[PDB]
Ligand binder design. Structure first.
Ligand SMILES: [Mg+2]
Ligand SMILES: [Mg+2]
Ligand SMILES: [Mg+2]
Ligand SMILES: [Mg+2]
Ligand SMILES: [Mg+2]
Ligand SMILES: [Mg+2]
Ligand SMILES: [Mg+2]
Ligand SMILES: [Mg+2]
Ligand SMILES: [Mg+2]
Ligand SMILES: [Mg+2]
Ligand SMILES: [Mg+2]
Ligand SMILES: [Mg+2]
Ligand SMILES: [Mg+2]
Ligand SMILES: [Mg+2]
Ligand SMILES: [Mg+2]
Ligand SMILES: [Mg+2]
Ligand SMILES: [Mg+2]
Ligand SMILES: [Mg+2]
Ligand SMILES: [Mg+2]
Ligand SMILES: [Mg+2]
Ligand SMILES: [Mg+2]
Ligand SMILES: [Mg+2]
Ligand SMILES: [Mg+2]
Ligand SMILES: [Mg+2]
Ligand SMILES: [Mg+2]
Ligand SMILES: [Mg+2]
Ligand SMILES: [Mg+2]
Ligand SMILES: [Mg+2]
Ligand SMILES: [Mg+2]
Ligand SMILES: [Mg+2]
Ligand SMILES: [Mg+2]
Ligand SMILES: [Mg+2]
Ligand SMILES: [Mg+2]
Ligand SMILES: [Mg+2]
Ligand SMILES: [Mg+2]
Ligand SMILES: [Mg+2]
Ligand SMILES: [Mg+2]
Ligand SMILES: [Mg+2]
Ligand SMILES: [Mg+2]
Ligand SMILES: [Mg+2]
Ligand SMILES: [Mg+2]
Ligand SMILES: [Mg+2]
Ligand SMILES: [Mg+2]
Ligand SMILES: [Mg+2]
Ligand SMILES: [Mg+2]
Ligand SMILES: [Mg+2]
Ligand SMILES: [Mg+2]
Ligand SMILES: [Mg+2]
Ligand SMILES: [Mg+2]
Ligand SMILES: [Mg+2]
Ligand SMILES: [Mg+2]
Ligand SMILES: [Mg+2]
Ligand SMILES: [Mg+2]
Ligand SMILES: [Mg+2]
Ligand SMILES: [Mg+2]
Ligand SMILES: [Mg+2]
Ligand SMILES: [Mg+2]
Ligand SMILES: [Mg+2]
Ligand SMILES: [Mg+2]
Ligand SMILES: [Mg+2]
Ligand SMILES: [Mg+2]
Ligand SMILES: [Mg+2]
Ligand SMILES: [Mg+2]
Ligand SMILES: [Mg+2]
Ligand SMILES: [Mg+2]
Ligand SMILES: [Mg+2]
Ligand SMILES: [Mg+2]
Ligand SMILES: [Mg+2]
Ligand SMILES: [Mg+2]
Ligand SMILES: [Mg+2]
Ligand SMILES: [Mg+2]
Ligand SMILES: [Mg+2]
Ligand SMILES: [Mg+2]
Ligand SMILES: [Mg+2]
Ligand SMILES: [Mg+2]
Ligand SMILES: [Mg+2]
Ligand SMILES: [Mg+2]
Ligand SMILES: [Mg+2]
Ligand SMILES: [Mg+2]
Ligand SMILES: [Mg+2]
Ligand SMILES: [Mg+2]
Ligand SMILES: [Mg+2]
Ligand SMILES: [Mg+2]
Ligand SMILES: [Mg+2]
Ligand SMILES: [Mg+2]
Ligand SMILES: [Mg+2]
Ligand SMILES: [Mg+2]
Ligand SMILES: [Mg+2]
Ligand SMILES: [Mg+2]
Ligand SMILES: [Mg+2]
Ligand SMILES: [Mg+2]
Ligand SMILES: [Mg+2]
Ligand SMILES: [Mg+2]
Ligand SMILES: [Mg+2]
Ligand SMILES: [Mg+2]
Ligand SMILES: [Mg+2]
Ligand SMILES: [Mg+2]
Ligand SMILES: [Mg+2]
Ligand SMILES: [Mg+2]
Ligand SMILES: [Mg+2]
Ligand SMILES: [Mg+2]
Ligand SMILES: [Mg+2]
Ligand SMILES: [Mg+2]
Ligand SMILES: [Mg+2]
Ligand SMILES: [Mg+2]
Ligand SMILES: [Mg+2]
Ligand SMILES: [Mg+2]
Ligand SMILES: [Mg+2]
Ligand SMILES: [Mg+2]
Ligand SMILES: [Mg+2]
Ligand SMILES: [Mg+2]
Ligand SMILES: [Mg+2]
Ligand SMILES: [Mg+2]
Ligand SMILES: [Mg+2]
Ligand SMILES: [Mg+2]
Ligand SMILES: [Mg+2]
Ligand SMILES: [Mg+2]
Ligand SMILES: [Mg+2]
Ligand SMILES: [Mg+2]
Ligand SMILES: [Mg+2]
Ligand SMILES: [Mg+2]
Ligand SMILES: [Mg+2]
Ligand SMILES: [Mg+2]
Ligand SMILES: [Mg+2]
Ligand SMILES: [Mg+2]
Ligand SMILES: [Mg+2]
Ligand SMILES: [Mg+2]
Ligand SMILES: [Mg+2]
Ligand SMILES: [Mg+2]
Ligand SMILES: [Mg+2]
Ligand SMILES: [Mg+2]
Ligand SMILES: [Mg+2]
Ligand SMILES: [Mg+2]
Ligand SMILES: [Mg+2]
Ligand SMILES: [Mg+2]
Ligand SMILES: [Mg+2]
Ligand SMILES: [Mg+2]
Ligand SMILES: [Mg+2]
Ligand SMILES: [Mg+2]
Ligand SMILES: [Mg+2]
Ligand SMILES: [Mg+2]
Ligand SMILES: [Mg+2]
Ligand SMILES: [Mg+2]
Ligand SMILES: [Mg+2]
Ligand SMILES: [Mg+2]
Ligand SMILES: [Mg+2]
Ligand SMILES: [Mg+2]
Ligand SMILES: [Mg+2]
Ligand SMILES: [Mg+2]
Ligand SMILES: [Mg+2]
Ligand SMILES: [Mg+2]
Ligand SMILES: [Mg+2]
Ligand SMILES: [Mg+2]
Ligand SMILES: [Mg+2]
Ligand SMILES: [Mg+2]
Ligand SMILES: [Mg+2]
Ligand SMILES: [Mg+2]
Ligand SMILES: [Mg+2]
Ligand SMILES: [Mg+2]
Ligand SMILES: [Mg+2]
Ligand SMILES: [Mg+2]
Ligand SMILES: [Mg+2]
Ligand SMILES: [Mg+2]
Ligand SMILES: [Mg+2]
Ligand SMILES: [Mg+2]
Ligand SMILES: [Mg+2]
Ligand SMILES: [Mg+2]
Ligand SMILES: [Mg+2]
Ligand SMILES: [Mg+2]
Ligand SMILES: [Mg+2]
Ligand SMILES: [Mg+2]
Ligand SMILES: [Mg+2]
Ligand SMILES: [Zn+2]
Lengths: 204, 122, 14, 118, 131, 59
RNA sequence: CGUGAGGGAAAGGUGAAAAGAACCCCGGGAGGGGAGUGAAAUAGAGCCUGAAACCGUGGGCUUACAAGCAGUCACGGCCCC
RNA sequence: GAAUGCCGGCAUGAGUAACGAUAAAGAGGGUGAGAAUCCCUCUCGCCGUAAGCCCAAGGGUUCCUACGCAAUGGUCGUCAG
RNA sequence: CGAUGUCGGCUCGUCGCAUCCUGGGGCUGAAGAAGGUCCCAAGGGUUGGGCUGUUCGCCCAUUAAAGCGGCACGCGAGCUGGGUUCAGAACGUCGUGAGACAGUUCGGUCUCUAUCCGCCACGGGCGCAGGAGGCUUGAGGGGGGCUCUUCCUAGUACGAGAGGACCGGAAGGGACGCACCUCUGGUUUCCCAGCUGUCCCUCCAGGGGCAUAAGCUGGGUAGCCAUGUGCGGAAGGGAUAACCGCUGAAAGCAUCUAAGCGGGAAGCCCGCCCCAAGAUGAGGCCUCCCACGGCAGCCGGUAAGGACCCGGGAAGACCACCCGGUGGAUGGGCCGGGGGUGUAAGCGCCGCGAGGCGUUGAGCCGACCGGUCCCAAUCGUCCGAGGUCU
């Protein structure tokens, strides 16, 4: 298993064997190893990486001593990669070669309080033929006296988006290590400027 | 984007001029036919002494559509109408000629007779 | 006790 | 949702809002300082800045552009002749907004002042 | 970081430059490389460019042509490597950027509405007087 | 609708418990550097008319 | 209230005596705080007595892993006499 | 202690729905203990076979002016039928 | 009976299993292919139409299939109201009659405000024996689970022929789900142009109001989007169902079983995605502060930190969350690029003129990508450990 942190730059498309290829561009590297997790000290294996340099005048004392115990300049974000144990102390995009498959995690776009039609693709109501103020409504939520309650997990309106989402089996399309770029074919969760994680794919 | 109730101009010389799609032959519940897709239709308007006549329930292949078809090279093509060519159960054209341009998509989908007969494959 | 608002008709349970 | 949308609405349709901004532009340019509410104040900045900038350019075209929102030759004359010259080397930032300590009694609204700068 | 610039950077390897600028209302001939399994050949497509939508590398123009009785529009990507070449055949004058209206016009009404752009035709002939 | 209604009167315990979130936050205040009078931060001082270290309006 | 015939309420009590609170203080006023009257002013005119529901301030015990017709029985803790 | 009892009082729902045409407002100046709400000016909008003007019915001082803001005004009020 | 709203439809599902399809099997009057019958299996799936108020049913066109039932014949404080089920009117029929009818016909008021449980979301409090900033383990949950065609193997096995495999291997689809906006396609309430009437500024020229809460029309960035794009169902490991066995007695034979072992499903456990230590059983690791002054208690000044206040944000109903606060690019302006519009005003020339041409891809120009301290995030305030006992 290998992973690296990154930022979603945006989408475009390239041309590869006379074929339009939609791609998302990820500024991934470079990620300093900040702490390693061993089954000795921690009970599992992982590598806490760092990403994006931070103004020292904004890094408080508990965190300063954490980076110092690794000899790493203070960084904005710290995320771990499970069961990944690199050799060096820096993880760069050259750990991905074109033609590989990756899974990408991001924070999906925040739809806020979302109705049942937008959230759950409910059919809504009719818009004519006598419908009375129910055009975007969910209809029935239960039975009658039996069971006398609404199930847990019932699909209702409420906050939708800004949650953790992972797309799987995204083809790596190109790697531009001089700019620490990573071209992935397809869509990636969340907005441009958002944070992503780019692991090896668990599909086969 | 052809669905049941859609009218299509008849692109061949079978005698039919308009057909109204009643089914999309593409699995259990496909919603739409585009170029290359077989449909079942009803002859709504034919000329007299034709191989087909109004009322016939015939098969057809859609050869050009008003909605654009996209392509792997990033290009897209759209026509001024939805048109179709009437075919037999072995996918061959019941007629003798095909009027107008046809979608290149018809080639790889196995309509090489209809592509040959076309005055132009766009 | 000014005006007596007449009550809604019941649902026809016939 | 509202993602990446620029523009306050201020509970006014398309033509009321504009007339609000144009009436506030007229009043501020006229008196040099007006008091309004904080949200209205923040939006008036850019509306008024652009006019002052157009006056700095001084061409006939600009005058007629400005006159579309201000409609007062005399005030537009004052804007081109007295106001614009004292910003010749100021690259933007022709206005400022400073919040006020007290609220109105009848609707508790927070106020602020808007003024042209020096 | 400059996200726009990175995008621009990623695109640069594919940006064409060798194509004649044109405008909606121009009549143009696109020579487009297309494959007829498994051979590949050039298929010309001549028509009025009715529309150009700009997005840097992602610009795409729409060309309209009537063909054996049926109106046909194709959309090309202005940097597609499938475009072999583009030839300007007529320079027409539009009053607006998008010409969807000509879809409902007669042949003579189109000709009346898009009269020859003498000013840019003079430029096309003004050039090609080179070394 | 079919006109929903409360089914029992709310006990003094449940009523006041719903108000367990109804207390006011005392106003945020800071001393003014010039006249030392207490006032909310980020506003012109209403007592001496000073902000950012200068006179800004009459009071 | 009802066009009308007609229907048809609620609402008593300062103190022995107005001695019904000069004057001063806060306040726009209302209201209060002093001063004064009285045997008595939580008899101050929104006035005898001043019950209960109901609202509140303060104090003692108690309560944020708990299953309830709210009590009863037992033991233990804390507070008071 | 019960009569969907009678009269009175006070709770709950609740700081909740609502504050009565989506013609529309902004600023400056003045008054005043107090001003989004009163006066003045400037800008903006609405009506104009009317949302302007004049009669009759009906209403009965609501007219004009001064001094007022407890209540009435669905907020505020220094303004007012 | 001091009221338990009644058909059908819509919406929304959830369960059963006597299984419609898909998976696994035994027997076959099972050559192959395709069927029949019974067993195991409820994971997923189970189409669009014509008629009728219909449920039902018939029909058309498909499909792997177009399953049957429970949930107050599920669901009217969720909708509908065509039918039933008031008062009108008429037909047939019955009644001298008034009127009557599981007889027909046309029409006929469906109630803004959710208190408690339940459900979807989001906080506040306290707790997790010192206080803090991070990063995490995953007990336990939830989600997901479908399937078809074509090709190779091979016109081989099988078959007189027609027809036509297993096993194994490729490619492409339908529907569904999550995400996204590069392309395609929407919108884009003032981003640009054009246009009529009228009132106006200022007479021309140029413009502004109104004609809708954009006057109309042609366009249209960001965002939000599907009709558009990416990706998912798995693989694999384990244990089983029916069923098939190996070895094997009782019972010299035989027997899948009594000792023991093996194979075997779209199902089950795990695996994948998401939540998740209020998991009070309150977990772990990295790092920071640390004996404060005075009478497991209290009252004070601090610590590491935190909150307030502010500028804001593809975060958002409030709240919360995330970023920034002058040692600063957070918002606003200004500048550049993008992008939209499609050649401004003014002047010069031409035409009696409406106009035309040039200056000119001009002018105007929201949100996009960046730059720049020009304006505003001034100045500050308040909380906040001294670590119980064995
Ligand atoms: Mg993340
Ligand atoms: Mg959704
Ligand atoms: Mg949807
Ligand atoms: Mg709908
Ligand atoms: Mg209705
Ligand atoms: Mg309703
Ligand atoms: Mg409606
Ligand atoms: Mg909805
Ligand atoms: Mg019911
Ligand atoms: Mg129950
Ligand atoms: Mg969220
Ligand atoms: Mg016929
Ligand atoms: Mg006919
Ligand atoms: Mg034709
Ligand atoms: Mg909206
Ligand atoms: Mg912004
Ligand atoms: Mg409002
Ligand atoms: Mg308007
Ligand atoms: Mg501007
Ligand atoms: Mg301020
Ligand atoms: Mg304030
Ligand atoms: Mg109802
Ligand atoms: Mg209703
Ligand atoms: Mg109600
Ligand atoms: Mg309650
Ligand atoms: Mg009470
Ligand atoms: Mg209480
Ligand atoms: Mg109580
Ligand atoms: Mg309560
Ligand atoms: Mg409350
Ligand atoms: Mg409280
Ligand atoms: Mg009366
Ligand atoms: Mg009377
Ligand atoms: Mg009496
Ligand atoms: Mg007496
Ligand atoms: Mg007396
Ligand atoms: Mg006495
Ligand atoms: Mg007396
Ligand atoms: Mg005084
Ligand atoms: Mg007094
Ligand atoms: Mg007092
Ligand atoms: Mg007194
Ligand atoms: Mg005595
Ligand atoms: Mg007493
Ligand atoms: Mg007494
Ligand atoms: Mg007495
Ligand atoms: Mg008393
Ligand atoms: Mg009393
Ligand atoms: Mg108490
Ligand atoms: Mg427990
Ligand atoms: Mg406890
Ligand atoms: Mg005991
Ligand atoms: Mg009794
Ligand atoms: Mg009683
Ligand atoms: Mg009573
Ligand atoms: Mg009450
Ligand atoms: Mg009451
Ligand atoms: Mg509230
Ligand atoms: Mg309520
Ligand atoms: Mg509410
Ligand atoms: Mg109400
Ligand atoms: Mg409200
Ligand atoms: Mg109302
Ligand atoms: Mg009103
Ligand atoms: Mg109103
Ligand atoms: Mg209007
Ligand atoms: Mg103004
Ligand atoms: Mg004023
Ligand atoms: Mg006022
Ligand atoms: Mg006032
Ligand atoms: Mg006035
Ligand atoms: Mg008139
Ligand atoms: Mg009179
Ligand atoms: Mg009267
Ligand atoms: Mg008067
Ligand atoms: Mg007066
Ligand atoms: Mg009053
Ligand atoms: Mg008052
Ligand atoms: Mg008063
Ligand atoms: Mg009085
Ligand atoms: Mg009142
Ligand atoms: Mg009042
Ligand atoms: Mg009122
Ligand atoms: Mg007031
Ligand atoms: Mg007064
Ligand atoms: Mg009953
Ligand atoms: Mg009752
Ligand atoms: Mg009852
Ligand atoms: Mg009842
Ligand atoms: Mg069911
Ligand atoms: Mg069974
Ligand atoms: Mg089966
Ligand atoms: Mg089988
Ligand atoms: Mg079988
Ligand atoms: Mg056989
Ligand atoms: Mg077989
Ligand atoms: Mg099943
Ligand atoms: Mg089922
Ligand atoms: Mg059906
Ligand atoms: Mg029909
Ligand atoms: Mg039907
Ligand atoms: Mg039916
Ligand atoms: Mg039937
Ligand atoms: Mg089958
Ligand atoms: Mg029912
Ligand atoms: Mg049912
Ligand atoms: Mg029902
Ligand atoms: Mg109803
Ligand atoms: Mg119903
Ligand atoms: Mg119900
Ligand atoms: Mg109900
Ligand atoms: Mg009916
Ligand atoms: Mg009806
Ligand atoms: Mg009746
Ligand atoms: Mg008869
Ligand atoms: Mg008779
Ligand atoms: Mg009849
Ligand atoms: Mg009827
Ligand atoms: Mg009718
Ligand atoms: Mg009837
Ligand atoms: Mg009605
Ligand atoms: Mg009601
Ligand atoms: Mg509630
Ligand atoms: Mg309850
Ligand atoms: Mg919490
Ligand atoms: Mg912990
Ligand atoms: Mg688990
Ligand atoms: Mg639990
Ligand atoms: Mg073969
Ligand atoms: Mg043979
Ligand atoms: Mg196979
Ligand atoms: Mg875009
Ligand atoms: Mg788009
Ligand atoms: Mg588009
Ligand atoms: Mg577009
Ligand atoms: Mg757009
Ligand atoms: Mg504009
Ligand atoms: Mg306009
Ligand atoms: Mg005009
Ligand atoms: Mg003019
Ligand atoms: Mg006007
Ligand atoms: Mg008007
Ligand atoms: Mg209209
Ligand atoms: Mg438009
Ligand atoms: Mg459009
Ligand atoms: Mg398995
Ligand atoms: Mg055997
Ligand atoms: Mg044996
Ligand atoms: Mg055994
Ligand atoms: Mg086994
Ligand atoms: Mg096994
Ligand atoms: Mg499967
Ligand atoms: Mg987590
Ligand atoms: Mg955790
Ligand atoms: Mg437990
Ligand atoms: Mg914990
Ligand atoms: Mg905010
Ligand atoms: Mg901060
Ligand atoms: Mg600071
Ligand atoms: Mg900035
Ligand atoms: Mg900036
Ligand atoms: Mg710009
Ligand atoms: Mg540009
Ligand atoms: Mg451009
Ligand atoms: Mg020109
Ligand atoms: Mg010009
Ligand atoms: Mg001109
Ligand atoms: Mg002349
Ligand atoms: Mg331009
Ligand atoms: Mg620009
Ligand atoms: Mg700098
Ligand atoms: Mg301070
Ligand atoms: Zn001060």
């Amino acid at each position: 298993m290998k992973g690296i942190l990154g930022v979603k730059v945006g989408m475009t498309r390239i041309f590869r064997d006379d074929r339009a290829v939609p791609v998302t561009v990820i500024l991934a590297g470079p990620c300093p190893v900040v702490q390693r997790r061993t089954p000795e000290k921690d009970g599992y294996t992982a590598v806490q990486l760092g990403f994006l340099p931070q103004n020292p005048k904004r890094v408080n004392r508990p965190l300063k001593g954490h980076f110092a115990k690794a000899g790493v300049e203070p960084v904005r974000i710290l995320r771990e990669i499970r069961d990944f144990n690199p050799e060096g102390d820096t993880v760069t995009v050259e750990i991905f070669k074109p033609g590989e498959r990756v899974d990408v995690t991001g924070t999906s776009k925040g739809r806020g309080f979302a109705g049942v039609m937008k959230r759950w693709n409910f059919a809504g109501g009719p818009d004519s033929h006598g419908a009375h103020k129910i055009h975007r409504h969910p209809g029935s939520i239960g039975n009658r006296k039996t069971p006398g309650r609404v199930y847990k997990g019932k699909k209702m309106a409420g906050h939708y988006g800004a949650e953790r989402v992972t797309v799987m089996n995204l083809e790596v399309v190109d790697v531009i290590p001089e700019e620490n770029l990573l071209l992935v074919k397809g869509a990636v969760p969340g907005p441009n400027g958002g944070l992503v994680i780019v692991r090896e794919t668990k599909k086969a | 984007m052809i669905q049941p109730q859609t009218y299509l101009e008849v692109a061949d010389n079978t005698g039919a001029r308009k057909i109204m799609c009643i089914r999309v032959l593409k699995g259990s519940n496909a919603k739409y036919a585009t170029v290359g897709d077989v449909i079942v239709a009803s002859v709504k308007e034919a000329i007299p002494r034709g191989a087909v006549k109004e009322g016939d329930v015939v098969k057809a292949v859609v050869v050009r559509t008003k909605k654009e078809i996209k392509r792997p090279d990033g290009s897209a093509i759209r026509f001024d109408d939805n048109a179709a060519v009437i075919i037999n159960n072995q996918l061959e054209p019941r007629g003798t000629r095909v009027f107008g341009p046809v979608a290149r998509e018809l080639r790889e989908k196995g309509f090489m007779k209809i592509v040959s007969l076309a005055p132009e494959v766009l | 006790p000014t005006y007596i608002p007449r009550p809604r008709p019941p649902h026809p349970r016939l | 949702m509202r993602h990446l949308k620029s523009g306050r609405k201020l509970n006014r349709h398309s033509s009321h809002r504009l007339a609000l901004y144009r009436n506030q532009a007229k009043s501020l340019l006229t008196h040099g300082r007006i008091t309004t509410t904080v949200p209205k104040a923040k939006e008036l900045r850019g509306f008024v800045d652009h006019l002052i900038h157009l006056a700095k350019r001084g061409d006939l075209h600009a005058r007629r552009l400005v006159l579309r929102d201000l409609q007062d030759v005399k005030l537009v004359r004052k804007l081109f002749d007295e106001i614009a010259p004292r910003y010749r080397d100021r690259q933007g930032g022709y206005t400022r907004v400073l919040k006020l300590a007290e609220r109105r009694r009848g609707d508790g609204a927070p106020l602020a002042l808007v003024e042209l700068v020096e | 970081m400059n996200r726009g610039a990175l995008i621009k950077l990623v695109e640069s390897r594919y940006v064409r430059t060798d194509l004649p600028e044109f405008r909606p209302g121009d009549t143009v001939r696109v020579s487009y490389k297309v494959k007829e399994g498994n051979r590949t050949r050039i298929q010309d497509f001549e028509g009025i460019v009715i529309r150009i939508r700009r997005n840097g590398f992602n610009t795409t123009f729409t060309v309209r042509k009537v063909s054996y009785g049926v109106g046909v529009e194709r959309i090309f990507p202005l940097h597609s490597p499938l475009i072999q070449k583009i030839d300007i055949v007529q320079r027409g004058r539009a009053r607006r950027a998008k010409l969807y209206f000509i879809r409902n016009l007669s042949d003579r009404e189109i000709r009346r509405k898009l009269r020859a752009d003498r000013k840019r035709i003079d430029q096309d002939r003004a050039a090609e007087r080179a070394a | 609708a079919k006109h929903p209604v409360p089914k029992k009167k709310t006990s003094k315990a449940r009523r006041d418990a719903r108000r367990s979130h109804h207390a006011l936050t005392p106003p945020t205040l800071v001393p003014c550097p010039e006249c030392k009078a207490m006032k909310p931060p980020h506003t012109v001082c209403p007592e001496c008319g000073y902000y950012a270290g200068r006179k800004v309006l009459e009071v």
